[PDB]
Design an enzyme around this catalytic site. Structure first.
Site, PDB file in Angstrom:
ATOM      1  N   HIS A 111       1.230  -1.450  -0.197  1.00  0.00           N
ATOM      2  CA  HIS A 111       0.190   0.147   0.504  1.00  0.00           C
ATOM      3  C   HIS A 111       1.247   1.227   0.474  1.00  0.00           C
ATOM      4  CE1 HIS A 111       0.417  -0.261   4.321  1.00  0.00           C
ATOM      5  NE2 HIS A 111       0.975   1.612   4.559  1.00  0.00           N
TER       6      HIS A 111
ATOM      7  N   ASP B  23      -0.494  -8.085   2.055  1.00  0.00           N
ATOM      8  CA  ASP B  23       0.398  -6.838   1.728  1.00  0.00           C
ATOM      9  C   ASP B  23       1.652  -6.495   1.750  1.00  0.00           C
ATOM     10  OD1 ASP B  23       0.076  -3.331   1.685  1.00  0.00           O
ATOM     11  OD2 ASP B  23      -0.794  -3.536   4.175  1.00  0.00           O
TER      12      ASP B  23
ATOM     13  N   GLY C 287       4.062   6.953   8.437  1.00  0.00           N
ATOM     14  CA  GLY C 287       5.495   7.126   8.048  1.00  0.00           C
ATOM     15  C   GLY C 287       6.374   6.320   8.026  1.00  0.00           C
TER      16      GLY C 287
ATOM     17  N   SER D  75       5.520   2.364   8.105  1.00  0.00           N
ATOM     18  CA  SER D  75       5.006   1.528   7.319  1.00  0.00           C
ATOM     19  C   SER D  75       6.377   0.747   6.459  1.00  0.00           C
ATOM     20  CB  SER D  75       3.627   1.114   6.851  1.00  0.00           C
ATOM     21  OG  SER D  75       2.828   2.493   6.706  1.00  0.00           O
TER      22      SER D  75
END
Ligand code: HUD
Ligand code: ZN
Ligand code: ZN
Lengths: 23, 184, 151, 17
Positions: free
Chosen positions: C29, C53, C109, C111
């Site tokens: 993502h 993901d 920020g 991830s």
């Protein structure tokens, strides 16, 4: 006497995540 | 040091420099860290600073002195039986402090700065959760075993291996340090 | 020095990437099916798992790969893009409660970042924050098992 | 072309230069 023990390096545990500096 | 336990390594001398320093006995290099990568002309291992003293295994340090800026330093403690020796921590080092929580989940810091998980099974033994070849563990004698908080639980002494793979490790509990100091 | 965690940017967003087992993983993502930049030109993802993901390119230069956890501790620690460490109690195989909740701004920020066990070994990959009224007090993560699975 | 760019790095151990 025999040879003296010599420090040939270190291992640092105190360290904490850091953003490796741009240089 | 702890939360989480991360560690790094730095080489400070080479073969030729080590030897002169062994004979000379005078070491002017700057010291930093809780664990020093120690070496004799015979073999290399680790020394761990805990509560102001720099320990390591007798079966590596023998009764030798440690090269320091002010020349050779005689051992503060020497216990053939406990297999421990200790010199006052080199000026510049940092000391670990004994564990006080009885955690059975110990972390062995190796000569390559790799902290690995060992589960305590005995007063002086823990088993690797991920066995590794003994070549890995080689040179980590004297290294520390930390509880989840980053405190000394014991010092790495021997590898419980078979076929060349290490399943567990024998260690010297920090209890032995106090005994040894109260001893000689 | 070799960094285990890379701070990455996309035309629109910035996130993190974590090198594990020679692969540089991150969140789909964030990366999408993009290619990672290299002094020899764009490199393509070795792995793309739009269901989990998860995406991975081969590890870039100046990086170090983290070791997967094998102790299975519940006391995790999250490292943000600002190098902050955030304790987390593993509630489930893919969720943990921050021991001290923080405004989403603090976790923003991050991830792609690593979830570390007391040994500093990769337990999982930070996937997303779980916030109530803009206060992150829990996070979702891609367990390493998945990463190792995709390999 | 539209790639992902590494803009910084983090060393979890705190290792300096
Ligand atoms: C450290 O002294 C070092 N120099 O790194 C080594 C580290 C081990 C991993 C290779 N420790 C030893 O060599 C100890 C020394 C000798 C025997 N040691 C061993 O580790 C044995 N194993 C062993 O003796 O195991 C039991 C369970 C105590 C029987 C091996 C691995 C060399 C076979 C002592 C104990 C003094
Ligand atoms: Zn403890
Ligand atoms: Zn672990």
């Amino acid at each position: 006497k025999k040879g003296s023990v010599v420090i040939v390096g270190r291992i640092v545990l105190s360290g904490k995540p850091a953003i490796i500096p741009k240089k | 040091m702890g939360a989480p336990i991360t560690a790094y390594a730095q080489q400070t001398r080479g073969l030729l420099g080590c030897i002169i320093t062994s004979l000379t006995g005078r070491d002017k290099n700057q010291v930093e860290g809780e664990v020093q990568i120690v070496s004799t002309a015979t073999q290399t291992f680790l020394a761990t600073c805990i509560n102001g003293v720099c320990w390591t295994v007798y079966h590596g340090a023998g009764t030798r002195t440690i090269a320091s800026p002010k020349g050779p330093v005689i051992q503060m403690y020497t216990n053939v039986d406990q297999d421990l020796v200790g010199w006052p921590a080199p000026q510049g080092s940092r000391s670990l402090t004994p564990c006080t929580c009885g955690s059975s989940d110990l972390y062995l810091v190796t000569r390559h700065a790799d902290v690995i998980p060992v589960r305590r099974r005995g007063d002086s033994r823990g088993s690797l959760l991920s066995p590794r070849p003994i070549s890995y563990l080689k040179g980590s004698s004297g290294g520390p075993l930390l509880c989840p908080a980053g405190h000394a639980v014991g010092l790495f002494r021997a590898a419980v291996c078979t076929r060349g793979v290490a399943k567990a490790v024998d260690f010297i509990p920090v209890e032995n340090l106090e005994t040894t100091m109260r001893s000689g």
